[PDB]
């Protein structure tokens, strides 16, 4: 009926505790937000199901 | 059915230290990989049932 | 001195089985409660280890190849297995390494050594003093050009014993990698008569020697008028490492407790 | 400014509709830096390595082991006497912030056309026949004109290269061979013969030679980093060690951010670092006092903002998810956390939920229909 | 990249040699999330 | 890359220059399989 | 091309140190004499 | 080239152009007929490949 809800902090996965990596991740624009939107879409719908 | 986490109040009390090591989830949490709780507890599912 | 001790019996080349031995810590990292996958020069499981003896009659000290590294183990009593020679010519045309545990200290050295055809060490057995003492060193005639030399702080290690079965197993891994001779080792108590014990136990690293030399062959050194003698009954086994992937099960506290050879 | 202004930003809208919104994970920041290095007092032998009276021949290159010493690479770096100083697995500035397990100086002399062949993955009779560096060489190549030290007017033929070899030599291999190269199909025994060559040839190094034909002294520093117990280190003083506080640690060059803690992990005497399933360090043996330290990343979690929309009110409640009300108040703005906002640290309604910690919402015993879903049986709503 | 550990690039290399290595790790890890979220979006349709 | 044939790279370039061209082909090829397997995982749901 | 604001920075150095006029550098000219911004837009011109 | 019945004087050195042919030196470097063959940018073995 459901699966485990997950949420992934896209900056902390890629660039964990690093400011330099964080300033470089900004060069890929919305990609991390798109990932968190998609996981929030899945995770809200496990409570719908 | 034997689960690996469900967002059951992680509090670095058992994670930080001996239990950061042997735990898929402690490595999950520390890297932005979080598991969220369902909206309905296993008691509320049982009341509807 | 330098002498050939030719009084021995001719026997064919023996072998036995490396069941689950020759596994060592592949790095200087702590791990626990984990099954870790690594590719390195390990002893292939259940390989033919080539088998050697000292008896009464037999004093098996052949000059053996050393290719991609070596596993060496001795089931031992009365401290018979005392060291090893390594090199590619052994006749002072090129350098060679000596590792020796004498009666008092360990010596480790690299030289253009001129080795004997039969290298060994010898002990005066119960000669009116009730104790036993080392007296003969006959391994090389000279050691002119040398480039690495170490001697341990002094001790006395005993050279006596006549119990039937073996009470000690001693295991060593020798890898000569990129100018470094790496030694890994284990000791365990046993109660076995004539074969390599079935079981598992991993070898901790113990010394890393920066020796820099080519090694292509090796030979072990045994304790013993010039000809006619009694050897102590002790037995040793030799295997060759290969690039094999291993899965390593670390327990709770933090030590290898089982392994799987992926090939 | 405030958690609502983070959601307005996160969504790129000045109006936020009713809901529970995901926001930046909070993370408690380091109170201070720690530095810890093995205490060695003698400075490494740079005057022996870079200033010997004679160097080796390239065919028989010397290798000196540098160990149990402090390395001040600022002396080598800042000195103008060097024409080449290139590093291949470190930037040259970082050499002083860092430690090395075993370090070596490969010392020899070559022509100024050949310095290019000393770089890893190269070809020509130096890279091919007498000094090959590995594909992953970690270290620095250091080179300078020594015409005034080495060269004599008729030719310093003491410096020898190898012109012939059966095969390209392996990385860091040295070859003392003087055995005769067979260029014809014939075998060739003894000292000499027709189309038989002595494999070595000498440089006619003279001061009247053009630049490039002069003797360049080379040192190649080789070293390996961060993988085993250090024995050579840069000119950094250790700080005191602190525990149970979040800090920017650095042990042997193992820079990081974490809470340090006394560990019960029984490291065997050869071990120094402990690695997690994720291939990051999670324990360290302190190099001055040989106790094991657990390393934990400083406390962090999801933040989510629960709002009743912008059209109604601006008031919001904040869920620190998977976090107990304790780690909240620990998150005091005194220790720098990501969120520049700390206004909610007031509480007096800091409800604890299975889902986490809820700040800014009152906990009413009465049970209503779920409005904004918080998780684990809890919901929130905006009411009188 | 030279290492899997982000701090062993940033404590070894400077501000201009690191950027080459850090960006291989940003590219590889970002593609690791885009793989996981694709798997999980397809998965969520099997559960739906 | 300078060619689609993996041996034409290795025949014409040294280790560090071939590793650049080969990493293009690996990055490309791998992105071909991750596209194919995504199409097949979606198409397997149409068939399921 | 066209340029919004333009500045010519004029000075004399030793010929070795022309390299230290590259962006992202270090050494006594690049340290405390004439440091460039790491994302410098411009051209460096030198003659004996 | 190598077997001509008369060579030029050095003050009037010849210049024979060569094309549309294969360079097998196996009757050449492999023969002791020359008291000096030296190449200066190639190994004499590599001339075939
Ligand atoms: C031990 O015996 C070997 C031969 O079995 C001796 O080796 C010979 O040494 C001489 C020079 O002294 C050489 O001319 C022979 O060619 C060698 N023979 C072999 C088969 O190698 C060796 O010298 C003897 N050593 C001692 C100490 O007597
Ligand atoms: C949040 O942490 C506190 C500790 O700070 C927990 O309180 C402990 O609870 C146990 C079990 O009832 C008691 O035996 C301890 O004495 C308590 N310690 C203190 C100092 O309060 C609390 O249970 C935790 N809450 C959750 C939801 O995990
Ligand atoms: C260098 C070379 O090839 N020389 C040959 C020679 O040996 C041979 O006798 C002659 C016959 O015409 O042709 C030419
Ligand atoms: C080991 O030795 C025996 C002879 O005693 C031989 O038949 C066998 O094939 C060998 N085993 C392996 C695995 O090489
Ligand atoms: C042990 O051997 C070494 C050389 O191998 C020698 O220097 C030393 O004197 C010996 N010790 C004894 C007690 O014989
Ligand atoms: C007995 O021991 C002494 C030294 O303790 C030694 O000098 C002597 O030679 C020994 N006697 C015999 C017969 O070995
Ligand atoms: C080794 O011995 C030979 C023969 O005497 C000598 O020519 C050479 O210089 C020696 N090498 C060293 C390093 O002493
Ligand atoms: C050691 O010497 C032997 C004999 O010359 C040779 O075949 C072997 O390749 C050498 N080993 C190394 C690592 O060069
Ligand atoms: C693990 O710890 C237990 C209890 O302290 C002990 O009995 C056992 O010997 C330990 N194992 C190892 C491999 O150290
Ligand atoms: C070598 O020694 C001289 C002193 O004789 C010193 O002036 C020079 O700077 C030293 N060179 C290096 C590279 O340290
Ligand atoms: C570091 O120095 C202290 C004294 O300053 C000493 O206790 C300690 O032994 C030293 N470190 C090591 C590894 O010996
Ligand atoms: C809120 O929005 C509604 C329309 O949705 C409007 O009728 C009302 O006047 C607004 N109130 C305020 C305080 O903005
Ligand atoms: C919730 O109910 C308990 C009795 O179970 C009562 O003591 C407490 O005061 C109530 N809380 C509120 C906020 O009314």
From Swiss-Prot, chain B:
Effect of residue 31 to K: In strain: Omicron/BA.1
UniProt-annotated stretches for the region Disordered: 3-28
Span list, region Fusion peptide 2: 10-30
Disulfide bonds: 15-26
Function: Subunit of the fusion protein that is processed upon entry into the host cell. Mediates fusion of the virion and cellular membranes by functioning as a class I viral fusion protein. Contains a viral fusion peptide that is unmasked after S2 cleavage. This cleavage can occur at the cell membrane by host TMPRSS2 or during endocytosis by host CSTL. In either case, this triggers an extensive and irreversible conformational change that leads to fusion of the viral envelope with the cellular cytoplasmic membrane, releasing viral genomic RNA into the host cell cytoplasm.
Protein name in the entry: Spike protein S2'
Organism of this sequence: Severe acute respiratory syndrome coronavirus 2
Lineage of producing organism: Viruses, Riboviria, Orthornavirae, Pisuviricota, Pisoniviricetes
Encoding gene (name): S
Entire protein: shown range: 826 to 874 of 1273
Curated annotation (Swiss-Prot), chain C:
Effect the entry attributes to changing residue 137 to L: In strain: A23.1, Omicron/BA.2.75
Segments for region (Disordered): 122-144, 153-165
Consequence recorded when altering residue 195 to G: In strain: Beta/B.1.351
Effect of residue 6 to I: In strain: Omicron/BQ.1.1, Omicron/XBB.1.5, Omicron/EG.5.1
Domain of life: Viruses
Disulphide bridges, residue numbers: 2-116, 111-146
Effect of residue 118 to Y: In strain: Gamma/P.1
Glycosylation sites: 4, 48, 102, 129, 145, 214, 253
Annotated effect of mutating residue 202 to V: In strain: 20A.EU1
Outcome recorded upon mutating residue 170 to K: Partial loss of biliverdin affinity
BetaCoV S1-NTD domain segment(s): 1-263
Function summary: Attaches the virion to the cell membrane by interacting with host receptor, initiating the infection. The major receptor is host ACE2. When S2/S2' has been cleaved, binding to the receptor triggers direct fusion at the cell membrane. When S2/S2' has not been cleaved, binding to the receptor results in internalization of the virus by endocytosis using host TFRC and GRM2 and leading to fusion of the virion membrane with the host endosomal membrane. Alternatively, may use NRP1/NRP2 and integrin as entry receptors.
Complex and partners: Binds to host ACE2. RBD also interacts with the N-linked glycan on 'Asn-90' of ACE2. Cleavage of S generates a polybasic C-terminal sequence on S1 that binds to host Neuropilin-1 (NRP1) and Neuropilin-2 (NRP2) receptors. Interacts with host integrin alpha-5/beta-1 (ITGA5:ITGB1) and with ACE2 in complex with integrin alpha-5/beta-1 (ITGA5:ITGB1). May interact via cytoplasmic c-terminus with M protein. May interact (via N-terminus) with host bilirubin and biliverdin, thereby preventing antibody binding to the SARS-CoV-2 spike NTD via an allosteric mechanism.
Name under which the protein is recorded: Spike protein S1
Parent-protein residues present: 14 to 292 of 1273
